[PDB]
Design a protein around this ligand. Structure first.
Ligand SMILES: Nc1ncnc2c1ncn2[C@@H]1O[C@H](COP(=O)(O)OP(=O)(O)OP(O)(O)=S)[C@@H](O)[C@H]1O
Ligand SMILES: Nc1ncnc2c1ncn2[C@@H]1O[C@H](COP(=O)(O)OP(=O)(O)OP(O)(O)=S)[C@@H](O)[C@H]1O
Ligand SMILES: Nc1ncnc2c1ncn2[C@@H]1O[C@H](COP(=O)(O)OP(=O)(O)OP(O)(O)=S)[C@@H](O)[C@H]1O
Ligand SMILES: Nc1ncnc2c1ncn2[C@@H]1O[C@H](COP(=O)(O)OP(=O)(O)OP(O)(O)=S)[C@@H](O)[C@H]1O
Lengths: 479, 448, 479, 449
């Protein structure tokens, strides 16, 4: 068992090193930057990645799959910290680095570096590049390797969910989902990237912010996310390229199968039909509360600021184009609760994907009807045919595990000296892969304690892996 | 050419033969066949094998087996190797309907006309709900004319009143009593007859304006709102899929695995899991506010002992589904308001294809010896005994009474002062059915 | 429909007035008190209770049952406010009174009266008496009328409980649970009451604190609950009379059926087998954290203080014999989370009874096992026979509704000007029926805004009624 | 396209795929389908409705094979009516669809291009063994001309312990060659060093025309069978009786009276009985010690064995069973029970002669375990083929494979080391291990033209 596994591990470490070249290339095409740690890392990882799989080139073939994917992020996440440790320009500690490594790779977006505006333009590419890499990682995993495992959380995910709509063939897996999905990934990143150029900003900010919106990360090369240029176009592009990137990519497979027959594939999927209503009702109510409060002078800005914040926080994107200055205290909290309703399943997204919430709202009302008609027979409507009792169980055990981790991770941050409010603001921001602390203009992750940043890493994985993937690691039955 | 000696084949074999038309029935059940051979020529047959089917057809189609699949083969064997005309074949299993358009409007299968029993009864049941207060609705070959039956009680506008006492006013749309069923046995309407209590007064009405007739007689109660069903089978699900959009439906199914699919197939319906006689379920789910309690099960005994209970709790109305059609009058009336038969509706549709262009069309109002018929008067006054002669001047056989006349698309109610014109569809009520080839010989044109 | 309901209402209003006499009797038996409002109320209610049912003496017979029990607390709770409005000795607002009326009757224990030590000894009896009345109310409803409705919270409960243990003579669905349970109720109140007399305190405080501890309660005649006399005996009696009074009363039905054959009935009930372990593990961990912190000089005090606080907060009792001065901030938070696991079902009880948590932990681990053995068949162990899928759903829809109300009731307190932390500290204290605010710095419910003091009333009902009972009231299917 | 994932569809789905041909199977049974998906495109199918059938196939276009639960055809007509897919093969079991095949099928009414009637194939096969006494199994290839005949080596046999080549020094009249040797259930490929031990399945090669001649030259053609006994009254039992009562003295044993009467009506010159198979009295009372073969054709394989085991103990010269599932045959064969027959190793035997038609390899009827005999076709002159002109002894065949014969047009050349393979030959060889086919399929196959 472990033998062929380390083959996979050292194999990926090599592939990660090949990624290190592209940043340093920028640190030579540009020379506002420091490239040596990337080339120092490229070598040391290639060795340490090669040293493990050479004596382990022996090939052999569920218990296998859970232990791979916790290594896919544990190993790659640790390796991601190395460039930051070496370079003296950030002057970043080890835990601050492991955090920024994981926060980047996990597509979280929670940063611990102050004043990154003037940081070198070489380390500034690597942060956004790691979000891109973890952006692709979730897609191949969520659509392909993960559903087989049994924690798919993609439409009617449970174990058997073999491509969903227009699922023809599908015999090759991961490998026929890593190749085909890349085209959507690349054709979506470039489209926004040149769109930002058409908005007007520099190539770097145009591109390295495309790696971030598409991967639903929330990073930036500026301390303020999209307040650097308070232009409706950039916001309206960042809004539309988060809504497009948040929905099921197996529904974005409605373009590579005999051309553009989109609307039938999209609208007949109940997850996308609920992604819109939840997204509209959010911004709709987050707008009426701004107009009644006169938080912004002209209702165009209020429209701009609101319609971006609800769709940058409830899609788990984590971009802040405001300071919630004129916003009621009661608005950042509501937006933070909306973070749990992350992007649609099968996409780069947050914790309880729309279906988990959709299934939860569906089932929770059925239990309200049966209270009056006990002898009636009720079913769930989501798809064409009602769900198997396995899936309904697989959502309600997921909510339980979620609010089991979220409480242990909270009484673990409290002990390290934080306060009740900041803990909630932190774990809800990291378990959901959000990033920004939220609340009444609060969390700055530099202030966080050393032994809390570890717990935060512990948590942001829990959200990125479907919580069970790592929760079963400490079970007696698995071992 | 038939392939059954069942209630369909037997009722046809009895109804259709007046020497007007000739046929040959097929059945492997000898004791039933030569019994049904009384009611013409009998070809003993095995399945749809060409020897029996194909040889009988040319030089010497209706296919009513136990199964649909055997029936389809028979229409194809007759269409492939002889190219036989017409071909009506009953098909019950729903999926052969669900893809009927794909299959049948592609011409692949050779059914010229379908008789889908589950569809006919369920459309019929919806036809009673639409006119509240109607016991039975009668359909003829001509869609334009139809009878509507009501129930006369104490306190009704029609009890004890003289028939002609209602004929003195002709308000707005008009009616006429074509038949009167009482105590199970038939009373033909006369001027001397009085409408006693608990009668089946069969009014005539143009199919277009039926509701108008019943409201002018003050019998159109409030529209039904809350419905209750009891069958989860082919008729129960079809009816639910038709009523959940317009009426508040509740269903009761006692087989869970089937109760689940009904929850999937029916979006806006409440399906249950219970036995029909579960007093708790009927009380717990507000049966004292039910307006009609359709029961659509397999066993006629269960429908009665449950639809009798729902009236007792009680519901506003009740309907059962007596599978064999031979007892419709017996169970009907009294405690159970309405009793429906698929084999008095499946046969009702078959007698509109067979009789096409013929002298008589046998109505859906066949019960016992009485049956309503529609006779066609061909030929001008020179080649017909019955054309031009006023209704009151036709020496009709005993018990027969003309109720209406259909001329093109307009329904003329029969009045004694009416003139029968050429190519008319006369609607009348026979108390005794042994007289048809007398009528069939009266209206029929003399040689041309 | 509505007619025979109002018959029941006016009938109980009359019965409530008959209760008003016992307070006023004390305001004349005692020499410190004001009796006119109780006797002014006794009359006006008897009239207003009689005026409704006299023209409605017409008798007639599920939709009936839900609307009764929300009136049982709405009507009686409003009526409870009347004495406080009239009496000028505690001149207190209307909403402060409605709150103290509901908080008493709902057995919450959250008070809004400052310095009640020297308040008259007549209003001091009425507050504790209302807890007694709501103490009896929950028992008759939880074990008898409520289970039939459809929300059980009673071992296996969905709607089918014959009590399981000694399921005999159950014919009168409520007429022999109100009669038989009263003897257990009275035989429990007196035992502790005279026990407090043997501890040494005055008859009044001895008795009127038994009304408070036997029912879930939380009230006091002193601002500090049981710090008035920091004596181990009173604590060690209040501890054992909360553990004994907190669990299933149908297990206290092991004494009225052929004498004292207790231990088999108690220990063979899995709810009591988990009530002990959850109670022990709490105090055990709340003890080692006090000993490691040297919060108290001698481990006898630490033992005294801890073993009382874990069993006064996890049972929903609400008694504070400390100020958590030397306690880590991290202890009041953990104890507040333990408030959800209140007393065993079918008894004066917390927000999610032990089974709801027990069923939740059982089912949540099955979802962890199935992840490795997908094709295995698993079942639930709690009782003799595994649970019907109806009950497992009725726990997991109850968790959803709970965290649906708790979030809506939270963003409703935030808007009225409170802060995120204090709202959480309030609704978690009222939804669970635990009076204390429970933080290092407590919430003192006088400071709560007027509009919030309504939402708290709205909330404490939600917890007292099984949350669904009132949640279906606003459903379209019910009306 | 295969409309089944059963033992037929699964055995095909494994055998036919060498990337030489591409197919798509249909099945509503997921656990068995994605199991059969190992062996390839799956189109799970709701009762053969058109959306499955034509879209899975007719748009892509490929040969249709339907083997699902029942006979009632509908799917082949759905493929023929509105799509016009070609070369449709559909299994049909129920006799009435066979008994009137000429009226129905030679009128072109039903669209079956080729039939696979299992009762017909098995019953014809059993008569083919009776005809050559002493033959355990007869192997049929795609080419009717060549066929293998298997015998059993005992103590006192002319073939025990003798050196293989020691028989190759004389070539008397018509000649043979040992293409396979099965012993103890596991396969031994023939070599010069191999010795014929006792209780072996020595598979001789023989031209289909002269099989009896081969067996009499090896002194193994015993006296023709005279008295036969059967035990099944079902579709195969009656068919076999209706075929043997004219040439052999038949006795039948049927345990359902109402069926025993019709067997008395349908069989004019046969004696059918009413009894249980293990009724010792009936077997003794009706002279079983003079039975020459005791065919057992029941529903339960357990019953066939436990009765055919009884009726060699009593005295039958031979015994035959019918192990219904075909994956078992070599495990009960030999020893006490002489022969075991499988319908699902014969239904599949005919399906791999239509599917493989004109292809590089034809999979023989001799598939048992991993071993299978195959027939490979050599196309192209010496310029576009590795295997043409090269002598048999000079071909670097994959391990375990040994050529046994060569079929040329209409004449069978026994493989000798000194033989030359000419173009458009049908080479017959024995694979000990079936994982090597796309090696052979790549060796014989002509290079690009
Ligand atoms: N193989 C067959 N070939 C021909 N007729 C068959 C065959 N099997 C059954 N039947 C018919 O089965 C019929 C009796 O059953 P059914 O008619 O199906 O019952 P039924 O349909 O409720 O009665 P009906 O509707 O009035 S015909 C007879 O008409 C038989 O001829
Ligand atoms: N006693 C009963 N009470 C309530 N429902 C019943 C009862 N008996 C049977 N049913 C229901 O009726 C069904 C019988 O349906 P099927 O026999 O499959 O088709 P069908 O309903 O008989 O056809 P029709 O059109 O109703 S005659 C059962 O499967 C149940 O759904
Ligand atoms: N009603 C049906 N419609 C379509 N396919 C079916 C149906 N019933 C079974 N099948 C398919 O046929 C297979 C099951 O058929 P079986 O009952 O095993 O037939 P079979 O006799 O076992 O076939 P063989 O000769 O033994 S391999 C599965 O692959 C199913 O997908
Ligand atoms: N000992 C026996 N046990 C079981 N069946 C027996 C036995 N002896 C004779 N039979 C006959 O075997 C018949 C089985 O026939 P079927 O059920 O139609 O299966 P079948 O496939 O038609 O028969 P086959 O395959 O042609 S041998 C039984 O009905 C009996 O008539």
């Amino acid at each position: 068992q472990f033998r062929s596994i380390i083959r996979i591990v050292g194999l990926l470490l090599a592939l990660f090193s090949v990624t290190m070249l592209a940043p340093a290339l920028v640190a030579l095409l540009y020379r506002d930057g420091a490239g040596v740690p990337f080339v120092t890392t490229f070598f040391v990882l290639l060795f340490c990645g090669a040293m493990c799989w050479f004596p382990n080139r022996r090939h052999k073939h569920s218990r296998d799959g859970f232990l791979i994917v916790v290594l896919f992020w544990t190993v790659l996440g640790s390796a991601g910290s190395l460039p930051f440790l070496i370079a003296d320009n950030p002057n970043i500690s080890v835990t601050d680095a492991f955090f920024e490594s994981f926060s980047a790779l996990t597509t979280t977006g929670a940063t611990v570096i102050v004043g990154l505006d003037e940081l070198p333009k070489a380390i500034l590419f690597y942060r956004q590049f790691l979000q891109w890499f973890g952006g692709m990682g979730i897609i191949v995993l969520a659509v392909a390797i993960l559903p087989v495992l049994g924690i798919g959380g993609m439409q009617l995910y449970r174990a058997e969910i073999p491509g969903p709509v227009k699922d023809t063939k599908m015999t090759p897996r991961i490998a026929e989902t890593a190749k085909a999905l890349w085209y959507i990934y690349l054709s979506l990143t470039i489209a926004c990237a040149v769109a930002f150029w058409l908005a007007g900003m520099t190539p770097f900010d145009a591109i390295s912010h495309s790696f971030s919106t598409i991967a639903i990360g929330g990073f930036s090369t500026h301390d303020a996310s999209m307040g650097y240029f308070d232009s409706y176009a950039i916001n309206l592009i960042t809004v539309v390229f988060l809504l497009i990137s948040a929905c099921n990519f197996t529904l974005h497979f409605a373009a590579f199968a005999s051309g553009g027959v989109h609307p039938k594939y999209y609208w007949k999927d109940p997850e996308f039909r609920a992604f819109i209503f939840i997204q509209v009702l959010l911004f709709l109510v987050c707008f009426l509360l701004l107009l009644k409060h006169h938080s912004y002078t002209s209702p165009y800005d209020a429209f701009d600021q609101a319609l971006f914040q609800t769709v940058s926080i409830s899609t788990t994107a984590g971009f802040t184009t405001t300071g919630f200055a004129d916003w009621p205290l009661f608005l950042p909290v509501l937006l933070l609760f909306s973070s749990f309703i992350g992007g649609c399943a099968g996409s780069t997204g947050g914790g309880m994907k729309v279906i988990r919430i959709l299934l939860l709202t569906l089932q929770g009302a059925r239990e309200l009807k049966r209270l009056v008609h006990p002898r009636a027979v009720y079913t769930i409507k989501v798809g064409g045919s009602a769900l198997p009792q396995r899936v309904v169980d697989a959502v309600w055990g997921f909510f339980s595990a979620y609010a089991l981790v979220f409480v242990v991770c909270m009484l673990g941050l409290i002990a390290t000296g934080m306060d009740e409010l900041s803990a909630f603001s932190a774990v809800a921001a990291t378990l959901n892969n959000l990033g920004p602390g939220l609340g009444e203009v609060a969390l700055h992750f530099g202030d966080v304690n050393d032994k809390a940043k570890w717990v935060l890493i512990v948590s942001m994985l829990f959200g990125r892996l479907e919580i069970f993937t790592l929760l079963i690691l400490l079970t007696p039955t698995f071992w | 050419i038939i392939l059954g000696a069942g209630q369909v084949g037997g009722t046809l074999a009895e109804n259709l033969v007046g020497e007007n038309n000739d046929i040959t029935i097929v059945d492997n059940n000898a004791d039933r066949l030569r019994e049904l051979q009384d009611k013409l020529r009998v070809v003993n047959g095995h399945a749809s094998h060409p020897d029996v089917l194909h040889e009988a057809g040319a030089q010497d189609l209706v296919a009513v087996t136990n199964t649909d699949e055997t029936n389809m083969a028979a229409c194809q064997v007759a269409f492939t190797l002889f190219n036989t005309p017409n071909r009506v074949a009953r098909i019950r299993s729903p999926e052969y309907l669900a893809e009927k358009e794909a299959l049948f409007k592609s011409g692949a299968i050779p059914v010229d006309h379908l008789i889908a029993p589950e569809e006919l009864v369920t459309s019929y049941i919806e036809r009673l709900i639409q006119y509240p207060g109607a016991l039975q609705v009668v359909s003829f070959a001509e869609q334009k004319v139809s009878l509507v039956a009501v129930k006369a009680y104490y306190g009704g506008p029609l009890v004890g009143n003289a028939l002609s006492a209602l004929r003195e006013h002709m308000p707005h749309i008009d009616t006429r009593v074509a038949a009167i069923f009482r105590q199970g046995r038939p009373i033909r309407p006369q001027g001397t007859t009085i409408i006693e209590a608990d009668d089946e007064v069969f009014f005539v009405a143009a199919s277009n304006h039926i509701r108008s007739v019943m409201s002018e007689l003050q019998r159109l109660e409030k529209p039904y709102r809350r419905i209750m069903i009891v069958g989860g089978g082919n008729i129960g699900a079809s009816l639910a899929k038709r009523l959940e959009q317009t009426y508040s439906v509740k269903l009761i199914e006692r087989d869970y695995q089937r109760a689940e699919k009904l929850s999937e197939q029916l979006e806006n319906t409440i399906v249950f899991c219970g036995d029909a006689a579960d007093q708790e379920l009927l009380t717990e789910e507000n049966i004292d506010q039910v307006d009609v309690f359709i029961a659509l099960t397999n066993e006629d005994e269960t429908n009665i002992m449950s639809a009798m209970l729902a009236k007792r709790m009680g519901a506003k109305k009740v309907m059962v589904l007596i599978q064999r059609g031979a007892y419709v009058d017996l169970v009907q009336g009294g405690v159970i308001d309405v009793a429906i038969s698929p084999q008095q509706a499946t046969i009702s549709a078959l007698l509109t294809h067979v009789r096409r262009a013929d002298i008589v069309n046998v109505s859906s109002l066949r019960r016992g010896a009485a049956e309503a018929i529609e006779a066609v008067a061909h030929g001008d006054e020179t080649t017909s005994k019955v054309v031009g002669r006023a209704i009151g001047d036709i020496k009709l056989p005993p018990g027969t009474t003309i109720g209406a006349v259909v001329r093109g698309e307009e329904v003329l109610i029969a009045h004694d002062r009416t003139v029968i014109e050429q190519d008319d569809h006369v609607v009348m009520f026979l108390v005794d059915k042994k007289y048809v080839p007398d009528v069939e010989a009266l209206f029929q044109p003399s040689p041309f």
